[PDB]
């Protein structure tokens, strides 16, 4: 498969999440995603084919993971945007107030602005701390997906936020949306991963 931020993958043939970013570690191919998407050794599929397995994860407290891939996977420095993409250029963190977009298999590519940092999400499974908030909407299935500026600076991976009874927060105003991401650089640093850039 072509490994692109925002695309669907399944976990154990049972749940769906979204790719965060293509990464490497030496000769091992991988992608980063959210920790609640899977436990270690769970099987990831794209297009119905096994692509790899979860290598490591932290959830709750943090909400991060990476999936180690078979060598046949094709890593791209890209985040899906409808029928095109944004190229991943780097990982410079954006400030509160700055425009940011996110990508995922339920809501597709959504844009808004960064509205807080250091937010705790009190999920039923446990608190997740240190999250950055934006007002782009999102919904269930989007988790793990890329957050990235239009200039290609990768920000983090979708964690969650104030999903409504319909499974998303697209049906409320942007001023009420809490769409939370796990910052990327601490994920790359804990796991010793290099972000694939173009």
């Amino acid at each position: 498969a072509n490994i692109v931020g925002g695309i669907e993958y399944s976990i154990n043939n049972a749940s769906l999440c979204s790719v965060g970013f293509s990464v490497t570690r030496g000769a091992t191919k991988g992608f980063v995603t959210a920790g609640h998407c899977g436990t270690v050794n769970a099987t990831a599929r794209i297009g119905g084919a096994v692509v790899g397995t979860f290598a490591a994860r932290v959830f709750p407290g943090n909400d991060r993971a990476w999936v180690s891939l078979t060598s046949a996977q094709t890593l791209l420095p890209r985040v899906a945007n409808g029928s095109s993409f944004v190229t991943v250029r780097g990982s410079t963190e954006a400030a509160v107030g700055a425009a940011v977009c996110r990508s995922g298999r339920t809501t597709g590519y959504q844009c808004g602005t960064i509205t807080a940092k250091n937010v705790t999400a009190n999920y039923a499974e446990g608190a997740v701390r240190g999250l950055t908030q934006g007002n782009a909407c999102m919904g269930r299935g989007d988790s793990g997906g890329s957050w990235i500026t239009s200039a290609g600076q990768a920000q983090g991976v979708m964690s969650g936020g104030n999903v409504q009874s319909n499974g998303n927060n697209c049906g409320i105003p942007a001023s009420q949306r809490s769409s939370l991401f796990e910052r990327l650089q601490p994920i790359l640093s804990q796991y010793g991963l290099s972000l694939v850039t173009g």
């Binding site: 959210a34 609640h36 909400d63 995922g104 339920t106 999400a121 009190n122 999920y123 039923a124 499974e125 999102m138 919904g139 269930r140 299935g141 989007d142 988790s143 979708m158 964690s159 969650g160 936020g161 104030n162 999903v163 809490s178 939370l180």
Partner: peptide, 4 residues
């Protein structure tokens, strides 16, 4: 809040 809930995970997505």
């Amino acid at each position: 809040a809930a995970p997505x």
